[PDB]
Amino acid sequence: PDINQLPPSILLKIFSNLSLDERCLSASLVCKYWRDLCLDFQFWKQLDLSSRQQVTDELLEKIASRSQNIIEINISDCRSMSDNGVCVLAFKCPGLLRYTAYRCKQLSDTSIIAVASHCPLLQKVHVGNQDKLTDEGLKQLGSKCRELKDIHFGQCYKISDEGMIVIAKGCLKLQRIYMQENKLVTDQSVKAFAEHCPELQYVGFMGCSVTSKGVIHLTKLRNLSSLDLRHITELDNETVMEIVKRCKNLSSLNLCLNWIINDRCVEVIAKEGQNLKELYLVSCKITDYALIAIGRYSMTIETVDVGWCKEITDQGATLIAQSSKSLRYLGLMRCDKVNEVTVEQLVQQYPHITFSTVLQDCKRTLERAYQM
């Protein structure tokens, strides 16, 4: 029984089921043939070198020296290489697609400049908590490589005004957007960029200073899917009504931590909402009155999230527990206004619920950690 008589396709399919550590540490010393098999464009076009700390500083010269089709560079949580060690790889970058580097503070705008001018093809630029990332490099990023299709620019307080307009006039193929607590973001950069590409599905502007003057004009596009407008500045209610009445295709709506937003929106969200799938209402000031409407007038619901609710109706929660057919997602936390019956009876009455109470999710977590 010789394993090396198998065709190379089968041997590569076998070797693809080993991690990079296993492949480069054990299977590369067995013999010449296995070492030559564990070195390909197959295994070296999806790098994913995240959190390899102080081991890859000048080594990036060899990973991309003869390799021709790196497309999935991932150096997230890097703390070893410098601008030189990333620009040397950035010089070639043949058809890079999904550059990703989170929390790599030592990287600066020089790396962005190196990666943005040597590959006119890109699909994902999901950079992260890198500070000192000024807006001069993103200008040329939008000017030279106008093929990028997805950005992520959280926690970079240097993207104030020029960046959005510069990758809004040239680039048009963007699909997803995500932003974080980035100050100095003006409203006069998104209103113009609201008529070119209406194919956006995911929108996230958490902790940002976008005024509702651009949210009002969102009625134009009718293809939006997911919303992440958390802590937003007084978005228009009638615009939300129109987008939920006309756009039947709507996936997610978070709207958490908003205080000027009133009870009317959640009162009316059960009037016609049939395809709504989850709701994240944490620390909401609900007046424990929409539960009757959300139980009686809603028949299609599977995810419900109760946050820091000071008051609640145990009878209503019990009624809605059996009112639905599959709505079992009670992740209760810090609910002081609770009895000791539901947490004692519904655990065994419904053996298809996980729950989230403190008394239960302490032994289960230890048990699942010990098993795996």
Binding site: E181, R230, C256, G307, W308, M333, R334, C362, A369
Partner: protein, 102 residues
């Protein structure tokens, strides 16, 4: 339960089986998913929207690391320990870490 709280506490102070990772000034606390949900509504805002196995959170530059360190032990032990040098930034008993309206 109480012994459940202590067991979770030790498992936190094992650096093993930690879900949520708090990133403040390069320093990284490693704690669970459920407990920080019980602690401060600000965090449970940023967790429950994801079912990802590994999570990451950053905090505003306003929240200080010196006052941040005792808070984790607060959350894990439900215990109060204080010194006269470090009070003003925690002066609401809703612990008022800078921004920080729950």
């Amino acid at each position: 339960s109480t012994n459940v709280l202590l067991s979770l506490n030790d498992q936190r102070k094992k650096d093993v089986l930690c879900d949520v990772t708090i990133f403040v000034e390069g320093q990284r606390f490693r704690a669970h998913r459920s407990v920080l949900a019980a602690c401060s509504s600000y965090f449970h805002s940023r967790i429950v929207g994801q079912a990802d196995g590994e999570l990451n959170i950053t905090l505003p530059e306003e929240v200080t690391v010196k006052g941040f360190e005792p808070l984790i032990q607060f959350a894990y032990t439900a215990k109060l320990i204080l010194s006269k040098e470090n009070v003003d930034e925690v002066c609401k008993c809703v612990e008022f870490l800078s921004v920080h309206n729950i």
